[PDB]
Amino acid sequence: PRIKTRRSKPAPDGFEKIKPTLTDFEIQLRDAQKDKSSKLAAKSNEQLWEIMQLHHQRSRYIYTLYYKRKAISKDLYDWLIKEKYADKLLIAKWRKTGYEKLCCLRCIQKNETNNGSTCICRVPRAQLEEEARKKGTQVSFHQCVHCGCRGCASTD
């Protein structure tokens, strides 16, 4: 996350209760930052998908404790927002309707795809199965590229 400095405030009360989960996410990021053997290209991109998964689960955990379960106060949530434990924008898209479950910020931007549309992971799995049935083949999509989410629309 962000380093602990003099200008950064100390944490509000309740943060030591949630330190083991954030510390587990921290040490898994410490393991996932190091380069592996990583010779292939299809398995080079998976070790970025693990880090996108860890960042997504950390922000999902903070979102779950603040908005869903209402255990963390506004002071501690704003401190976890200042110290970059979770993105403002991912939590903000999770506040929206239709983007409750979401992979990452990259897969809802129409600015980065070649077609001017969103990413294929925002299509529901049932819609992909409907087009697979209408074409006759199987669902020819398994793992999204920016992040490794199989399907991340709000239904599925």
Binding site: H56, K101, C103, R125, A126, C147, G148, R150, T155
Partner: peptide, 27 residues
């Protein structure tokens, strides 16, 4: 087209939990 209860009893069928739950259906 699936009903909402069918979406509930199909989004449990993905093996992991979260967006990274696999739809691959090995077993």
């Amino acid at each position: 087209h699936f009903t909402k209860s069918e979406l509930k009893r199909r989004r449990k069928t993905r093996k992991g939990d979260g967006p990274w739950g696999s739809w691959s259906s090995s077993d």
